[PDB]
Amino acid sequence: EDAGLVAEAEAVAAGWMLDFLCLSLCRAFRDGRSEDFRRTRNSAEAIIHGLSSLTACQLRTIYICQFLTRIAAGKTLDAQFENDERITPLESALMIWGSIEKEHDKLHEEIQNLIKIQAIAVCMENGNFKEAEEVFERIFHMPFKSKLLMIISQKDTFHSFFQHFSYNHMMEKIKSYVNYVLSEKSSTFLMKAAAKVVESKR
């Protein structure tokens, strides 16, 4: 009925806005536009909280946005993303990564491993060796478990190992994944309609 049809239209539009915001968040992440990312993050969060129902596809979209936000805050060790205050931002990203309904291909495994490694490295670069060991215990598996344990034990913050499995390396692999999400939803309604309006003026 009238009110019901309006409510359905609102649900449809909310779904469109979620997709569009995800796309915008991915681009800001890719381009390194930190302030735009923060603002788009707040918008996406508001739209998500306003949803009264979700489809599996939307849940995946939500996870993707949550994942990127945790990654963007990877070095902000004082940021609490989970109810359990002990969980660091990268550990939170790791949990989300392991929940997303996606294929565990090579890129997936590469990202997973790099996040596990950097979750420990960011703590060590802050001189927080006790916290690094605590992160290790919570996370640990991979073939580098023993090496990480040793690196932590010896407080070897700038071990060559980290030079290879660096934060930048982690970021570039995730940006590769973002390019995939980007191409996958660059055709969602809102973005497509807006692009059409922009072109319809040229």
Binding site: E45, H49, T76, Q80, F81
Partner: peptide, 13 residues
């Protein structure tokens, strides 16, 4: 809790 994108608060470091 919640589908939070932003932090829930500050963490004890």
């Amino acid at each position: 809790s919640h589908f939070n994108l932003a932090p829930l608060g500050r963490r004890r470091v």
